[model samples]
Target: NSNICEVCNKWGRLFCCDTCPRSFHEHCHIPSVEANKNPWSCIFCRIKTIQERCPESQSGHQESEVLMRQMLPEEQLKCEFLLLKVYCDSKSCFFASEPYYNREGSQGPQKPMWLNKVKTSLNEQMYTRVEGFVQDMRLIFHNHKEFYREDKFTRLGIQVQDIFEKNFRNIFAIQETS
Candidate 1:
């Protein structure tokens, strides 16, 4: 009674990988649970497997994860999925993908409602000195079509987010079910 295949749900004698903890069944050498296999890795399990199987190193996977861990978490803050606001010297307003701060507390623009920051570009100049905040947001949306990708347009005024709850959620707003 080892770990079962998440897909087929078969349970039996299994193998585990580096720091994986749970072991998966061999046949499903599949460990073909046969004797003719170099420790081929289980596609689903990613652990050591059948003796005649091909080996794949985890280094590449490790490196990409390391890069994204810091980048993606921070990127999520300003990612287009949410509404963002950035202030450039008062009347000058810049709407960007994320809200960026020099330090931790020193405020520039409010960290948006749905919350976000990206700045310093061609669009920055176009947006500078724009006084009316809400109207400017509306105009920013009108200026570009594919600005944010998909329906993710404009500085999605966060005021509207409060109204929706139930299935009106958007955790899967970006890609897919994975």
Candidate 2:
């Protein structure tokens, strides 16, 4: 069914992902799919190969103390990939850097959040736990919707967050054995 590129939603000589229905034009996909690479999966599916090394949450814990634990390098890399995928949408650049306009006293993000800031925090190990990083990710869009209201920025926020959550879940696919 995915005869068209999933990223651009257009028809082309697409490279079909062996693991999922999604297909992409060589330029549309990350790392750019190379020719003659049969049985190659997309990035989302590729994450599964290393997912086992990542940590997990215990059952019945309200707030899931697993998030309170320090984020492993694997988790940090997952978030980095997620951000990279999001940036593929040029509109997302609006949230990548801090805004120049001042809102020191106005109704705005008291604790401003941006994509680069999140990346920097993760790289510096400023986020003690994964939950803090997740909170910051959500805060970026949360502030957008609050400040921009019904504008295009708000719409982009929804789209960006959707992509984030979907990729995040895929990268951190929970395989419960309990």
Top model number, lDDT = 2
Evaluate residue 58 in candidate 1 and report its C-alpha lDDT on the 0 to 100 scale. Answer: 21
Candidate 2 runs further than 4 Å off: 1-48, 52-66, 100-106, 174-178
Write the residue-wise lDDT of candidate 2 on 1-178 in tens digits.
3998766567988888888898888856654576777888876676555654434521223335535657776566556567657766666778888955344443776888897787677657787777887789889888887777655657988888887776656555533343
Clashes per model (N, Cα, C within 3 A): 19, 0
Instruction: Write down the TM-score of every candidate.
Output: 0.18, 0.60
Q: Name the Cα RMSD for model 2.
A: 6.4
State each model's CA lDDT, in order.
Answer: 0.29, 0.69
For model 1, give the 10-residue run with minimal summed lDDT: 163-172
Compared with the true structure, the alpha-carbon lDDT of candidate 1 equals 0.29
lDDT of 2 at 28: 62
Residues 49-134, model 1: lDDT tens digits: 32124333222233223223332322222221112112211212233344343434333343232112122221133222212222
